[PDB]
Amino acid sequence: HMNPIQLDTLLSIIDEGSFEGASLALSISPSAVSQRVKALEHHVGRVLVSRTQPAKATEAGEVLVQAARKMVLLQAETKAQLSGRLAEIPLTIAINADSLSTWFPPVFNEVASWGGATLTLRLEDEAHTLSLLRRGDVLGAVTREANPVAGCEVVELGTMRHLAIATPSLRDAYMVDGKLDWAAMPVLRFGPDRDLDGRVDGPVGRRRVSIVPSAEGFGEAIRRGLGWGLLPETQAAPMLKAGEVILLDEIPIDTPMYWQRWRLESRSLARLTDAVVDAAIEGLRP
Amino acid sequence: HMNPIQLDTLLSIIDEGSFEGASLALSISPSAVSQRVKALEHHVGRVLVSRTQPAKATEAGEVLVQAARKMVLLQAETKAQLSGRLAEIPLTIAINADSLSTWFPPVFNEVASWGGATLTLRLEDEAHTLSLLRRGDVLGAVTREANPVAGCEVVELGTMRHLAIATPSLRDAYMVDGKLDWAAMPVLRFGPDRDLDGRVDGPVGRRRVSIVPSAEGFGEAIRRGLGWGLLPETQAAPMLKAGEVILLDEIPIDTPMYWQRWRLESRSLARLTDAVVDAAIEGLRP
C-alpha cells in the first residue's frame, strides 16, 4: 500500500513549488521531506517530482498528484457534510471557446443555484486540456478526445456542427470564371491547411488569414466580410436567417464532443456532470 | 484532514459489527480500536458509533463510513491506474551522438525482449545531459562525468577512443615540405580550438569548417574528403580497412565513459543498466 503521508508531501512540494516550501508548509525538517520523497519514489520505482523550482511532477508523478487532489476533494465534501453547511467547492474546468459560446452557459444557472460553489473556466487547446486533466489541474473538461485520460471517465455529449460561411459580397469577390477560388479567399482563424481538404486539388499557395481570438469576434469578422470561416451552426444560424452570410457548402463538418471527469465518488463532480450533459442534450446534435 | 487510519477503524467496526471484530480484522488490540475511535470522535465533535453490538453508526458516523468506502475505492483504482501508466511510460535516457552511433544499439535488442517497454533517447551535450539527470528529467545518462550527481549512482562503462582521420588525397593536399598544415586543412564539426593542441604551436589563424549534425553524415563527409575530423575508432575502422581514409596521427584521444542512473529500487532501471553495461563492454575499450 501507498503511504498517504508521503502522498501529502509530494502534493505539498508541487503546491508550494519546492522541497523547502513543503518543509515550511508541513512543519517538518527538510530531511523528512527528502526521506518521504525517497520512500515514495522507491515504492513506485520512478522519479516522481523534479528537483528544480518550480517543482514539476514527472509523467509517473502526475498520477499520484491527480490522485492526491481527488482525495482533497473527497475530504472537503466530507467536511462539508458533517459541518451542516453548503459545501462551497471550487470547480476547475477546461473548455473550448466553441462550447462556451454556444450550449454551455446554461450550466451557469445550475451552478449558481447550489450552495456556494464556484467555477474556474480554462479556455485551452486540445493538448493542454488533456494535460490539465492528467495532472489534476482541472477535474473536468469538454474535449474532442474520446479516449479517457488516465484517472478519468468519459461521457459523450453529442456532436458540434460547423458550417462554412461567408458574406455574399465576399464570395462574389473570389468567384473567378464561375468557380470559387478557395485558396485566394481571406479566411478567419481563432489563433495561430486542413480546411481546404476536398475543396482544392493542387498545391495551395500562401493564404490570407485574419486572427480574431474570441468566438464572438470570430463570428463578427465573418459576418462583416473580413473572411470566410467555419462557424458553429448555432452562431451562424441568425446570420444565415438575416441573409448576412451564405453557405459556401451544403456539407457540414460534425465534431463529436466529450465530457471527461475525474473517476471519483464525488457528489460535486456528479452534479456538475449532470448540468453539463443536460446542457449538451439541449444544445448539441445526437 | 481526517486521519484515514481512524476512518478505516470506524469502517471496520461497522463492517465487522463490533469493536472486537475490528480488532481481529485489523490485527490491533481492542485498546487500539478504542483509542482511534475516541480520537476520531473528538476530532469531529460527535459520537460516531455505538459501543453495543451489532455496531451502528450514528448520523455523523454514517457520513464517515460512506466517506471511508469512497476512499477505499479511490485507493484501489489509483493503484490500478499507476500500474498501467507505468507500463506505458518510456524510460528516458540522455546520450551523446557518438555512443548512439557505435556501441549502444545492442541495448535496443534487450529492451525489445521485455514486455512492451519503450525508450525515449535525448541526444544532449555534456552540460545539458547532467542537468537533465540532476533535475530528474531523465532516469539515466551516458556521461563523461565520473562523480555521481545528486540522487544517482555511477558505473564506469569503458573508454571511447577517437582517431584523427582524413582521405589520403586530403592529407597530401595539405602536405608542404613534408609537414602537414593542420590549421589550413578543412575540418568536420558536429555543430556550431582544442583540436589542434599538440598539432600546431603558435596562435592559429582562421579555419575552414563544415558542420554536419549527424554522426553518420559527419563520418561520410570525412570519408568523402570534405575535411578531416576526430572520429570514433568504431566508425573509422571500416574506412581505414577499405583504405578510404588514413590516420593523420598515431595519437588517439581517449575519453572514459560512465553510466549514471537514479538510485531507485526499480527492476526496470536495473535491467536497463545491465543492458547498457553489457553493450558498453562489447563496444568500448576496457
Side-chain angles (χ1 to χ4, degrees), chain B residues 194-272:
Chain B
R194 38 162 181 180
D195 61 339
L196 303 184
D197 286 12
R199 275 149 190 151
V200 175
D201 303 357
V204 178
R206 281 174 292 278
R207 306 197 50 191
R208 320 204 179 185
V209 182
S210 294
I211 293 174
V212 188
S214 100
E216 287 74 13
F218 183 98
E220 280 302 310
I222 295 172
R223 184 176 164 256
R224 299 169 179 269
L226 190 57
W228 80 279
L230 294 179
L231 197 67
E233 74 170 342
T234 298
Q235 287 185 55
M239 316 175 184
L240 290 152
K241 172 151 190 154
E244 301 170 338
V245 303
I246 49 77
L247 283 182
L248 299 170
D249 190 332
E250 305 296 351
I251 297 308
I253 300 173
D254 287 349
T255 303
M257 301 290 224
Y258 304 88
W259 172 251
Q260 300 224 15
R261 74 193 155 298
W262 278 77
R263 177 178 302 274
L264 303 140
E265 298 315 279
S266 166
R267 312 208 279 213
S268 314
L269 209 42
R271 296 188 86 177
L272 178 62

Coordinates of all heavy atoms in Angstrom, one line a residue, chain B residues 194-272:
Chain B
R194 N 40.5 23.5 -29.4 CA 41.2 22.4 -28.7 C 41.8 21.4 -29.6 O 42.8 20.8 -29.3 CB 40.2 21.7 -27.8 CG 38.8 21.6 -28.4 CD 37.9 20.6 -27.8 NE 36.6 20.5 -28.5 CZ 35.6 19.7 -28.2 NH1 35.7 18.9 -27.1 NH2 34.4 19.7 -28.8
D195 N 41.2 21.1 -30.8 CA 41.5 20.0 -31.7 C 42.9 20.1 -32.3 O 43.4 19.1 -32.8 CB 40.5 19.8 -32.8 CG 40.4 21.0 -33.7 OD1 40.8 22.1 -33.3 OD2 39.9 20.8 -34.8
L196 N 43.6 21.3 -32.3 CA 44.9 21.4 -32.8 C 46.0 21.4 -31.7 O 47.2 21.4 -32.0 CB 45.0 22.7 -33.6 CG 44.0 22.9 -34.8 CD1 44.4 24.2 -35.5 CD2 44.0 21.7 -35.7
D197 N 45.6 21.4 -30.5 CA 46.6 21.4 -29.4 C 47.5 20.2 -29.6 O 47.1 19.1 -29.9 CB 45.8 21.2 -28.0 CG 45.2 22.5 -27.6 OD1 45.1 23.4 -28.4 OD2 44.7 22.6 -26.4
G198 N 48.8 20.5 -29.5 CA 49.8 19.5 -29.8 C 49.9 19.1 -31.2 O 50.6 18.1 -31.6
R199 N 49.2 19.8 -32.1 CA 49.4 19.7 -33.6 C 50.0 21.0 -34.2 O 50.6 20.9 -35.2 CB 48.1 19.3 -34.2 CG 47.8 17.8 -34.2 CD 46.4 17.5 -34.2 NE 46.3 16.1 -33.9 CZ 45.2 15.5 -33.3 NH1 44.2 16.2 -32.8 NH2 45.3 14.2 -33.1
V200 N 49.7 22.1 -33.6 CA 50.2 23.4 -34.1 C 50.7 24.1 -32.8 O 50.1 24.0 -31.7 CB 49.1 24.2 -34.8 CG1 49.7 25.6 -35.2 CG2 48.7 23.5 -36.1
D201 N 51.7 24.9 -33.0 CA 52.3 25.6 -31.9 C 51.6 27.0 -31.6 O 50.8 27.1 -30.8 CB 53.8 25.8 -32.1 CG 54.5 24.5 -32.3 OD1 53.9 23.5 -32.2 OD2 55.8 24.5 -32.5
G202 N 52.0 28.0 -32.4 CA 51.7 29.4 -32.2 C 50.2 29.6 -32.4 O 49.4 28.7 -32.6
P203 N 49.8 30.9 -32.3 CA 48.4 31.3 -32.5 C 47.9 30.8 -33.8 O 48.6 31.0 -34.9 CB 48.4 32.8 -32.3 CG 49.6 33.1 -31.5 CD 50.6 32.1 -31.8
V204 N 46.6 30.3 -33.8 CA 46.0 29.7 -35.0 C 45.2 30.7 -35.8 O 44.4 31.5 -35.2 CB 45.2 28.5 -34.6 CG1 44.5 27.9 -35.8 CG2 46.0 27.5 -33.8
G205 N 45.4 30.7 -37.1 CA 44.6 31.6 -38.0 C 43.1 31.1 -38.1 O 42.7 30.2 -37.3
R206 N 42.4 31.7 -39.0 CA 41.1 31.2 -39.4 C 41.1 29.7 -39.7 O 42.2 29.1 -40.0 CB 40.5 31.9 -40.6 CG 39.9 33.3 -40.3 CD 39.6 33.9 -41.6 NE 40.8 34.2 -42.4 CZ 41.6 35.3 -42.2 NH1 41.3 36.2 -41.3 NH2 42.6 35.5 -43.0
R207 N 40.0 29.0 -39.7 CA 39.9 27.6 -40.0 C 38.7 27.4 -41.0 O 37.7 28.1 -40.9 CB 39.8 26.7 -38.8 CG 41.0 27.0 -37.8 CD 41.1 25.8 -36.9 NE 41.1 24.6 -37.6 CZ 41.1 23.4 -37.1 NH1 40.9 23.3 -35.8 NH2 41.1 22.3 -37.9
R208 N 38.9 26.4 -41.8 CA 37.8 26.1 -42.8 C 37.0 24.9 -42.2 O 37.5 23.9 -41.9 CB 38.5 25.6 -44.1 CG 39.7 26.5 -44.5 CD 40.0 26.5 -45.9 NE 41.2 27.4 -46.1 CZ 41.7 27.7 -47.3 NH1 41.2 27.2 -48.4 NH2 42.8 28.5 -47.4
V209 N 35.7 25.2 -42.0 CA 34.9 24.3 -41.2 C 33.6 24.0 -41.9 O 32.9 24.9 -42.4 CB 34.5 25.0 -39.8 CG1 33.7 24.0 -39.0 CG2 35.8 25.4 -39.1
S210 N 33.3 22.7 -42.0 CA 32.0 22.2 -42.4 C 31.3 21.6 -41.2 O 32.0 21.0 -40.3 CB 32.0 21.2 -43.5 OG 32.5 21.8 -44.7
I211 N 30.0 21.8 -41.1 CA 29.2 21.3 -40.0 C 28.2 20.3 -40.5 O 27.4 20.6 -41.4 CB 28.5 22.4 -39.3 CG1 29.5 23.3 -38.6 CG2 27.5 21.9 -38.2 CD1 28.9 24.6 -37.9
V212 N 28.2 19.1 -40.0 CA 27.3 18.0 -40.3 C 26.7 17.4 -39.1 O 27.4 16.6 -38.4 CB 27.9 17.0 -41.3 CG1 26.8 16.0 -41.8 CG2 28.6 17.7 -42.4
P213 N 25.5 17.8 -38.7 CA 25.0 17.4 -37.4 C 24.4 16.0 -37.2 O 23.4 15.8 -36.5 CB 23.8 18.4 -37.1 CG 23.9 19.3 -38.3 CD 24.5 18.6 -39.4
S214 N 25.0 15.0 -37.9 CA 24.7 13.6 -37.6 C 26.0 12.8 -37.6 O 26.9 13.1 -38.4 CB 23.7 13.1 -38.6 OG 24.3 12.3 -39.7
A215 N 26.1 11.9 -36.7 CA 27.3 11.0 -36.5 C 27.7 10.4 -37.8 O 28.8 10.4 -38.2 CB 27.1 10.0 -35.4
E216 N 26.7 9.8 -38.5 CA 27.0 9.1 -39.8 C 27.3 10.0 -40.9 O 28.2 9.7 -41.7 CB 25.8 8.2 -40.1 CG 25.7 6.9 -39.2 CD 25.1 7.3 -37.9 OE1 24.6 8.4 -37.7 OE2 25.1 6.4 -37.0
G217 N 26.6 11.2 -41.0 CA 26.9 12.1 -42.0 C 28.2 12.8 -41.8 O 29.0 13.1 -42.7
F218 N 28.6 13.1 -40.5 CA 29.9 13.5 -40.2 C 31.0 12.6 -40.7 O 31.9 13.0 -41.4 CB 29.9 13.6 -38.6 CG 31.2 14.1 -38.1 CD1 31.3 15.5 -37.7 CD2 32.3 13.3 -37.8 CE1 32.5 16.0 -37.2 CE2 33.5 13.8 -37.3 CZ 33.6 15.1 -37.0
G219 N 30.8 11.3 -40.5 CA 31.7 10.3 -41.0 C 31.8 10.3 -42.5 O 32.9 10.2 -43.1
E220 N 30.6 10.4 -43.1 CA 30.6 10.4 -44.6 C 31.3 11.6 -45.2 O 32.0 11.5 -46.2 CB 29.1 10.5 -45.1 CG 28.4 9.1 -45.1 CD 29.2 8.1 -45.9 OE1 29.5 8.4 -47.1 OE2 29.5 7.0 -45.4
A221 N 31.2 12.8 -44.6 CA 31.9 14.0 -45.1 C 33.4 13.8 -45.0 O 34.1 14.2 -45.9 CB 31.5 15.2 -44.3
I222 N 33.9 13.2 -43.9 CA 35.3 12.8 -43.8 C 35.7 11.8 -44.9 O 36.6 11.9 -45.6 CB 35.7 12.3 -42.4 CG1 35.5 13.5 -41.4 CG2 37.1 11.7 -42.4 CD1 35.6 13.0 -39.9
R223 N 34.9 10.7 -44.9 CA 35.1 9.6 -45.9 C 35.2 10.2 -47.3 O 35.9 9.6 -48.1 CB 34.0 8.6 -45.7 CG 34.1 7.4 -46.6 CD 33.0 6.5 -46.3 NE 32.9 5.5 -47.4 CZ 32.0 5.5 -48.4 NH1 31.0 6.5 -48.3 NH2 32.0 4.6 -49.3
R224 N 34.6 11.3 -47.6 CA 34.5 11.8 -48.9 C 35.4 13.1 -49.1 O 35.2 13.7 -50.2 CB 33.0 12.1 -49.3 CG 32.1 10.9 -49.2 CD 30.7 11.3 -49.3 NE 29.8 10.1 -49.3 CZ 29.4 9.4 -50.4 NH1 29.8 9.9 -51.6 NH2 28.7 8.4 -50.3
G225 N 36.3 13.4 -48.2 CA 37.3 14.4 -48.4 C 36.8 15.8 -48.1 O 37.7 16.7 -48.3
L226 N 35.6 16.1 -47.6 CA 35.2 17.4 -47.3 C 36.1 18.0 -46.2 O 36.1 19.3 -46.0 CB 33.7 17.4 -46.9 CG 33.1 18.8 -46.8 CD1 33.3 19.6 -48.1 CD2 31.6 18.7 -46.4
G227 N 36.7 17.2 -45.3 CA 37.6 17.7 -44.2 C 38.1 16.5 -43.4 O 37.6 15.4 -43.5
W228 N 39.1 16.7 -42.6 CA 39.5 15.7 -41.6 C 38.6 15.9 -40.4 O 37.8 16.8 -40.3 CB 41.0 15.9 -41.2 CG 41.2 17.0 -40.2 CD1 41.4 18.3 -40.5 CD2 41.4 16.8 -38.8 NE1 41.6 19.0 -39.3 CE2 41.7 18.1 -38.3 CE3 41.5 15.7 -37.9 CZ2 41.9 18.4 -36.9 CZ3 41.7 16.0 -36.6 CH2 41.9 17.3 -36.1
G229 N 38.7 14.9 -39.5 CA 37.9 15.1 -38.2 C 38.3 14.0 -37.2 O 39.0 13.0 -37.5
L230 N 37.9 14.3 -36.0 CA 38.1 13.3 -34.9 C 36.9 12.3 -34.9 O 35.8 12.8 -34.7 CB 38.3 13.9 -33.6 CG 39.6 14.7 -33.5 CD1 39.7 15.4 -32.1 CD2 40.8 13.9 -33.8
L231 N 37.1 11.1 -35.3 CA 36.1 10.1 -35.5 C 36.3 8.9 -34.5 O 37.4 8.4 -34.3 CB 36.1 9.6 -36.9 CG 34.8 8.9 -37.5 CD1 33.6 9.9 -37.5 CD2 35.2 8.4 -38.8
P232 N 35.2 8.4 -34.0 CA 35.3 7.2 -33.1 C 35.9 6.0 -33.9 O 35.5 5.8 -35.0 CB 33.9 6.9 -32.7 CG 33.1 8.2 -32.9 CD 33.8 8.7 -34.2
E233 N 36.9 5.4 -33.2 CA 37.6 4.3 -33.9 C 36.6 3.2 -34.4 O 36.8 2.6 -35.5 CB 38.6 3.7 -33.0 CG 38.1 2.8 -31.9 CD 39.2 2.0 -31.2 OE1 40.3 1.9 -31.8 OE2 39.0 1.5 -30.1
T234 N 35.5 3.0 -33.7 CA 34.4 2.2 -34.2 C 34.0 2.6 -35.6 O 33.9 1.7 -36.5 CB 33.3 2.2 -33.2 OG1 33.7 1.7 -31.9 CG2 32.1 1.3 -33.7
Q235 N 33.7 3.8 -35.8 CA 33.2 4.3 -37.1 C 34.3 4.3 -38.1 O 34.1 4.0 -39.3 CB 32.6 5.7 -37.0 CG 31.3 5.9 -36.3 CD 30.8 7.3 -36.4 OE1 30.7 7.9 -37.5 NE2 30.5 7.9 -35.3
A236 N 35.6 4.6 -37.7 CA 36.7 4.8 -38.6 C 37.2 3.4 -39.1 O 37.8 3.4 -40.2 CB 37.8 5.6 -38.0
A237 N 37.1 2.4 -38.3 CA 37.7 1.1 -38.7 C 37.4 0.6 -40.1 O 38.3 0.1 -40.8 CB 37.3 0.0 -37.6
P238 N 36.1 0.6 -40.5 CA 35.8 0.2 -41.9 C 36.4 1.0 -42.9 O 36.9 0.5 -43.9 CB 34.3 0.2 -41.9 CG 33.8 0.2 -40.5 CD 34.9 0.9 -39.7
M239 N 36.4 2.4 -42.8 CA 37.0 3.3 -43.8 C 38.5 3.0 -43.8 O 39.1 3.0 -44.9 CB 36.7 4.7 -43.4 CG 35.3 5.0 -43.0 SD 35.2 6.8 -42.5 CE 33.5 6.9 -42.0
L240 N 39.2 2.8 -42.7 CA 40.6 2.5 -42.7 C 40.9 1.2 -43.4 O 41.8 1.0 -44.2 CB 41.1 2.5 -41.3 CG 41.2 3.9 -40.6 CD1 41.1 3.9 -39.1 CD2 42.5 4.6 -41.0
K241 N 40.1 0.2 -43.0 CA 40.2 -1.2 -43.6 C 40.1 -1.1 -45.1 O 40.8 -1.8 -45.9 CB 39.2 -2.2 -43.0 CG 39.2 -3.5 -43.7 CD 38.9 -4.6 -42.8 CE 39.1 -6.0 -43.5 NZ 39.4 -7.1 -42.5
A242 N 39.1 -0.3 -45.6 CA 38.9 -0.1 -47.0 C 39.9 0.8 -47.7 O 39.8 1.0 -48.9 CB 37.5 0.4 -47.3
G243 N 40.8 1.4 -46.9 CA 41.7 2.3 -47.5 C 41.1 3.7 -47.9 O 41.8 4.4 -48.6
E244 N 39.9 3.9 -47.5 CA 39.2 5.2 -47.9 C 39.8 6.4 -47.1 O 39.9 7.5 -47.6 CB 37.7 5.1 -47.7 CG 37.1 4.0 -48.5 CD 35.7 3.7 -48.1 OE1 35.3 4.1 -47.0 OE2 34.9 3.2 -48.9
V245 N 40.2 6.2 -45.8 CA 40.9 7.2 -45.0 C 42.1 6.6 -44.4 O 42.3 5.4 -44.4 CB 39.9 7.8 -43.9 CG1 38.6 8.3 -44.5 CG2 39.7 6.7 -42.9
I246 N 43.0 7.5 -43.9 CA 44.2 7.1 -43.2 C 44.3 7.9 -41.9 O 43.5 8.8 -41.6 CB 45.4 7.4 -44.1 CG1 45.4 8.9 -44.6 CG2 45.6 6.4 -45.2 CD1 45.7 10.0 -43.7
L247 N 45.2 7.4 -41.0 CA 45.4 8.1 -39.8 C 46.4 9.3 -40.1 O 47.4 9.1 -40.7 CB 46.1 7.2 -38.7 CG 45.3 6.2 -38.0 CD1 46.1 5.5 -37.0 CD2 44.1 6.9 -37.3
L248 N 45.9 10.5 -39.7 CA 46.8 11.7 -39.7 C 47.8 11.7 -38.5 O 48.6 12.6 -38.4 CB 46.0 13.0 -39.6 CG 45.0 13.2 -40.8 CD1 44.1 14.3 -40.5 CD2 45.8 13.4 -42.1
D249 N 47.7 10.7 -37.6 CA 48.3 10.9 -36.3 C 48.1 9.5 -35.6 O 47.1 8.9 -35.5 CB 47.5 12.0 -35.6 CG 48.2 12.4 -34.3 OD1 48.8 11.6 -33.7 OD2 48.0 13.6 -34.0
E250 N 49.2 9.1 -35.0 CA 49.2 7.9 -34.1 C 48.7 8.2 -32.7 O 48.7 7.3 -31.9 CB 50.6 7.3 -34.1 CG 51.2 7.0 -35.4 CD 50.4 5.9 -36.2 OE1 49.5 5.3 -35.6 OE2 50.7 5.7 -37.4
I251 N 48.3 9.4 -32.4 CA 47.9 9.8 -31.1 C 46.4 9.7 -30.9 O 45.7 10.7 -31.3 CB 48.4 11.2 -30.7 CG1 49.9 11.2 -30.7 CG2 47.8 11.6 -29.3 CD1 50.6 10.1 -29.8
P252 N 45.8 8.7 -30.4 CA 44.4 8.6 -30.1 C 44.0 9.6 -29.0 O 44.9 10.0 -28.2 CB 44.1 7.2 -29.8 CG 45.4 6.4 -30.0 CD 46.5 7.4 -29.9
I253 N 42.7 9.9 -29.0 CA 42.2 10.7 -27.9 C 41.2 9.8 -27.1 O 40.2 9.4 -27.7 CB 41.5 12.0 -28.3 CG1 42.5 12.9 -29.0 CG2 40.9 12.7 -27.1 CD1 41.9 14.1 -29.7
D254 N 41.4 9.5 -25.9 CA 40.6 8.6 -25.1 C 39.8 9.3 -24.1 O 40.2 10.3 -23.5 CB 41.5 7.6 -24.4 CG 42.1 6.5 -25.3 OD1 41.7 6.5 -26.5 OD2 43.0 5.8 -24.8
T255 N 38.5 9.0 -24.0 CA 37.5 9.6 -23.2 C 36.8 8.5 -22.4 O 36.0 7.7 -22.9 CB 36.5 10.4 -24.0 OG1 37.2 11.4 -24.8 CG2 35.6 11.1 -23.0
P256 N 37.1 8.4 -21.1 CA 36.4 7.4 -20.3 C 34.9 7.8 -20.1 O 34.6 9.0 -20.0 CB 37.1 7.4 -18.9 CG 37.9 8.7 -18.9 CD 38.3 8.9 -20.4
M257 N 34.0 6.8 -20.2 CA 32.6 7.0 -20.2 C 32.0 6.3 -19.0 O 32.4 5.3 -18.5 CB 31.9 6.4 -21.4 CG 32.5 7.1 -22.7 SD 31.9 8.8 -22.9 CE 31.5 8.8 -24.6
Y258 N 30.8 6.9 -18.5 CA 30.1 6.4 -17.3 C 28.6 6.3 -17.6 O 28.1 7.0 -18.4 CB 30.4 7.3 -16.1 CG 31.9 7.4 -15.8 CD1 32.7 8.4 -16.5 CD2 32.6 6.6 -14.9 CE1 34.0 8.5 -16.2 CE2 33.9 6.7 -14.7 CZ 34.6 7.7 -15.3 OH 36.0 7.8 -15.1
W259 N 28.0 5.4 -16.8 CA 26.5 5.3 -16.8 C 26.0 5.8 -15.4 O 26.4 5.3 -14.4 CB 26.1 3.9 -17.0 CG 24.6 3.7 -16.8 CD1 24.0 3.0 -15.8 CD2 23.6 4.1 -17.7 NE1 22.7 3.0 -16.0 CE2 22.3 3.7 -17.1 CE3 23.5 4.9 -18.8 CZ2 21.1 4.0 -17.7 CZ3 22.3 5.2 -19.4 CH2 21.1 4.7 -18.8
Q260 N 25.2 6.8 -15.5 CA 24.6 7.4 -14.3 C 23.1 7.2 -14.3 O 22.4 7.5 -15.3 CB 24.8 8.9 -14.2 CG 26.3 9.2 -14.1 CD 26.6 10.3 -13.1 OE1 25.8 10.6 -12.3 NE2 27.8 10.8 -13.1
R261 N 22.5 6.7 -13.2 CA 21.1 6.4 -13.1 C 20.6 6.8 -11.7 O 21.4 6.7 -10.8 CB 20.8 4.9 -13.3 CG 21.2 4.0 -12.2 CD 21.2 2.6 -12.5 NE 22.1 1.8 -11.6 CZ 23.4 2.0 -11.6 NH1 24.0 2.9 -12.3 NH2 24.2 1.2 -10.8
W262 N 19.4 7.2 -11.7 CA 18.8 7.5 -10.4 C 18.7 6.2 -9.5 O 18.4 5.1 -9.9 CB 17.3 8.0 -10.5 CG 17.4 9.5 -10.8 CD1 17.7 10.1 -12.0 CD2 17.2 10.5 -9.9 NE1 17.7 11.5 -11.8 CE2 17.3 11.8 -10.5 CE3 16.8 10.6 -8.5 CZ2 17.2 13.0 -9.9 CZ3 16.6 11.8 -7.9 CH2 16.8 13.0 -8.6
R263 N 19.1 6.5 -8.2 CA 19.1 5.4 -7.2 C 17.6 5.2 -6.8 O 17.0 6.0 -6.2 CB 19.9 5.8 -6.0 CG 19.8 4.8 -4.9 CD 20.7 5.2 -3.7 NE 22.1 5.4 -4.1 CZ 22.9 4.4 -4.2 NH1 22.6 3.2 -3.8 NH2 24.2 4.6 -4.6
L264 N 17.1 4.0 -7.2 CA 15.7 3.6 -7.1 C 15.7 2.1 -7.1 O 16.4 1.5 -7.9 CB 14.8 4.2 -8.1 CG 14.6 5.6 -8.5 CD1 14.5 5.8 -10.0 CD2 13.4 6.2 -7.8
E265 N 14.9 1.5 -6.3 CA 14.7 0.0 -6.3 C 13.7 -0.3 -7.4 O 12.6 -0.7 -7.2 CB 14.2 -0.5 -4.9 CG 15.2 -0.2 -3.8 CD 16.7 -0.5 -4.3 OE1 17.0 -1.7 -4.2 OE2 17.4 0.4 -4.6
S266 N 14.2 -0.1 -8.6 CA 13.5 -0.4 -9.8 C 14.1 -1.5 -10.6 O 15.3 -1.4 -11.0 CB 13.4 0.9 -10.7 OG 12.9 0.5 -12.0
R267 N 13.3 -2.6 -10.8 CA 13.8 -3.7 -11.6 C 13.9 -3.3 -13.1 O 14.8 -3.7 -13.8 CB 13.0 -4.9 -11.4 CG 12.8 -5.1 -9.9 CD 12.6 -6.6 -9.5 NE 11.2 -6.9 -9.6 CZ 10.5 -7.8 -8.8 NH1 11.2 -8.3 -7.8 NH2 9.3 -8.1 -9.0
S268 N 13.0 -2.3 -13.5 CA 13.1 -1.8 -14.9 C 14.4 -1.1 -15.1 O 15.2 -1.3 -16.1 CB 12.0 -0.8 -15.1 OG 10.7 -1.4 -14.6
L269 N 14.8 -0.1 -14.2 CA 16.1 0.6 -14.3 C 17.3 -0.4 -14.2 O 18.2 -0.3 -14.9 CB 16.2 1.6 -13.2 CG 17.0 2.9 -13.5 CD1 16.8 3.3 -15.0 CD2 16.8 4.0 -12.5
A270 N 17.2 -1.3 -13.2 CA 18.3 -2.3 -13.1 C 18.5 -3.1 -14.4 O 19.6 -3.3 -14.8 CB 18.0 -3.3 -11.9
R271 N 17.4 -3.5 -15.1 CA 17.6 -4.2 -16.3 C 18.2 -3.3 -17.4 O 19.1 -3.8 -18.1 CB 16.2 -4.7 -16.8 CG 15.5 -5.7 -15.9 CD 14.3 -6.3 -16.6 NE 14.6 -7.5 -17.5 CZ 13.7 -8.2 -18.2 NH1 12.4 -7.9 -18.1 NH2 14.1 -9.2 -18.9
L272 N 17.7 -2.1 -17.5 CA 18.3 -1.2 -18.5 C 19.8 -1.0 -18.2 O 20.6 -1.0 -19.2 CB 17.6 0.2 -18.4 CG 18.2 1.2 -19.4 CD1 18.0 0.7 -20.8 CD2 17.5 2.5 -19.2

